[model samples]
Target: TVHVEVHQRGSSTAKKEDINLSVRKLLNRHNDYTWTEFDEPFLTRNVQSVSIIVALHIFQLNEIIAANHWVLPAAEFHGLWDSLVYDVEVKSHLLDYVMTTLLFSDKNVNSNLITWNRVVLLHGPPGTGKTSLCKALAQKLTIRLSSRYRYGQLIEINSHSLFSKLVTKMFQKIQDLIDDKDALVFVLIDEVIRVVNAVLTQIDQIKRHSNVVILTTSNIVDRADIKQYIGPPSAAAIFKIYLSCLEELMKCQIIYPRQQLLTLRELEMIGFIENNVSKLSLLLNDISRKSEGLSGRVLRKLPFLAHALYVQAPTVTIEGFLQALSLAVDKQFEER
Candidate 1:
């Protein structure tokens, strides 16, 4: 089953209408919340407990203005793995690491002796899809371990707005959820340095929870204690995030002559000329070289901006598209 809850301050009662309104406002749409029913009976308790815990924590917080919770199946995030452009080997390595850690923790009688910490820390520059990779990993784990887990719960804590008191209360609630042996819980804290600084003392206390996994992302690496919390980084331990590759650009269709052919009319609308189509490979190679050091987020948006701001054409040639794209790539560096 799929359920959503929105918490906002200064409200005495949580009316269904108010929640619907808040959700619509937050999501900037009315139909984004599609309530679905699932046949699985075991997940009902797990879902309710997660919502109750999140609701209670939000009520006590003064710094946080709002929070959202979702109980969903791994299948909901099916395409995220493909959409996120990262190295395939790095992705596979992460999958193996998490799976092995969980399995070893389950078999080991003495959790203290294992010392895995049950935490996955992803540190990288902003717009590098660090947070998306964590969500993708959580989704992948739930689907891979379907036999052991019935469902997955995601609770995203905005650490920037939360103070030390709220951080303590929040981690306590996380601990309560972690105590649930049946549910697979993922606690995602974006910009975790804020939380680490707030409640640095509670890291060891929360590290004991085996069922719950904490996925944190940080853009900065100034903290020395973060290494102590996650353990020392080694060649096998660290996953280096690189810029998008030409293959990924082709997969995303930023380059012309995609594997899946565009419609003839769509081609005409984009101004694709038959003669210029042959030069797509050379142009793409040049574009890839020019787009070095750009984030995946910017690479993905380049095509749309090329079409919108630069080309502004109802029908433009493949060469025209390439020219616009090149201009956009240059514009990114100039702006910086």
Candidate 2:
């Protein structure tokens, strides 16, 4: 079924003709009817294996709408979920909360008994991948719910848009879409302090809608109520993150005491060549400890920095690599 309804808000009015024209433009420019098939269940498949069509719509300050579309999982977002190094418990709890709230809202009998805001607030320090996690979560949900909803849409409303005089009217536009229960709408607001100041009242009203879920991320934890605090990665997790980056060099036999030629040079450089496995583990542990209080973003970059700035030879020992990594870690703190 297709329905076109237009409404006037504030001094701007959208006529039925203009609305139809915009719809036609959207169809002509951003139409993607091809839906990929997922043989494995959502939880079992890697993020790389899942794909969906994403249609992007931009709302300019003048109220003009521009449309674009593409298929995902896109390259920019590839392996985002798998590479996101965070506490498993936090991710699991968040997933459970979203599923419970949406499922409860689906039942008309339970809808009025308890009202959920359907808003998730992730507060943490800078470079914690808060925004990336929000994006990955939305992508995961769309894939998980593909069997139920024919299509999913993610609307990223910048703070500037919410602060405009059109705030109420903008939400009204969203509310009209929420009226359709068949589609899934995930709204992502990055750095949400301004939105709270600008449209708290509108958000209060919009919270009544069940099908729309809002995910917000902010570095200002106290400004808004915080649901999850993404702290620095644990030492073991830090080791895993760094190891994943260095595994290729290890596999290619370009790293560590395995190469006899490099081992002698490494012995001369460091004056000691201990058991390969024990020495490597010890060095990784030391580096991980040094990386304490660092964000995952910086942690991931450390290996590259070590290789680029410190490593001098084509093939190096694990001890040599860690020596370079130690220098990089110290340099990071110096900049701070």
Candidate 3:
């Protein structure tokens, strides 16, 4: 019965019309009995597939997309443009150019010699907000580019998810979306583990299409592509921003009763660290001049570690608190 319905729904208009004409002709021939009937399914039984009449089953592969596998695009990003402390212009300007050329190119132009696959690559060291930048771009494009383009859909895909033995149906579903003419589509591939040939080939195919733009984030540039180099942020850049966040939190006086709990020397030490946090143009300069070459990650890490050690001050001495900072720096080193 379902097979019949699939045929009925999928039958072309001309074929259905042809069948109706035959039915009318047969009715006219039989003047004694002016009645005609035709099986709707049989007219289009040869049609293999119908866009509307699809079967639903539990094991069906592409029926439902994994919740985490996709991120729908929106007009505004969750994180404000000012909230991002990293380099803004290159991330925004270069990205804007790529999106603009692909989505809003003048249709009246005589010829377009330039060919861009609409793929943007972002690469940087760990904890440097590479992934966050990709997400920000997704929202940024929606808000900034929506005026020029129609639909804003962001589909974030895990690279390896495209290579699983059962990955075909889900990919087909994505391709099916590209066929849709209603809206603009964007694909973000984050933190690619190891590039498999199959994944590369699949992305290559997606790139050929004019409607989709591919954005990727990676820890290493050589691992992904070398067109743009968004390397790890400098240590000074790290201290300036994170220190401000810490200062803002401190000034808010949320650490009140706990603040009074510390001894006079410990209090002085906290003030000293904040004042000299920027030793020169590097990380951990004010905290410890000897500790150089540390990444923004270390600065981001010390606050939590300091809190854990400070609670001990109720029983431990001022020297113990200093040791905690020293230990924290050592821990950051060992991680590298």
- RMSD values for the candidates in order, in angstroms, are 13.1, 13.9, 21.4
Candidate 3 lDDT by residue in tens digits, 1-336? 111111222223435344435434433454311112334454344332222111211100110253133333332444334345553356656555666555544342222554444667776677666666666666555444443544455667654454434345556767877787454567777754343555566677776666677777777713332145565444344444444434433455433321212222343566534323222112333444434456445555675676585544333322333355557767777877
Q: Pick the candidate with the highest TM-score.
A: 2
Candidate ordering by lDDT (highest first) = 2, 1, 3
What TM value does model 2 have? 0.62
Q: Cα lDDT of model 3 overall?
A: 0.48
Question: What C-alpha lDDT values do all the predictions have?
Answer: 0.54, 0.60, 0.48
Q: What tens digits encode model 1's per-residue C-alpha lDDT throughout 210-234?
A: 6767777777623311221211222
What global local distance difference test value does model 1 have?
0.54
Q: Which residue runs of candidate 3 sit more than 4 Å off their true CA positions?
A: 1-77, 80-84, 87-89, 103-112, 149-151, 161-165, 176-182, 190-198, 221-226, 247-285, 288-292, 296-298, 311-327, 334-336
Q: Using Cα atoms with residue i matched to residue i, what is each candidate's TM-score against the true structure?
A: 0.58, 0.62, 0.54
Candidate 2: global Cα-lDDT?
A: 0.60
Least lDDT summed over 10 consecutive residues: which range in candidate 2? 58-67
Q: What's the true lDDT of residue 88 in model 1?
A: 39
lDDT score for residue 72 of model 2 = 25
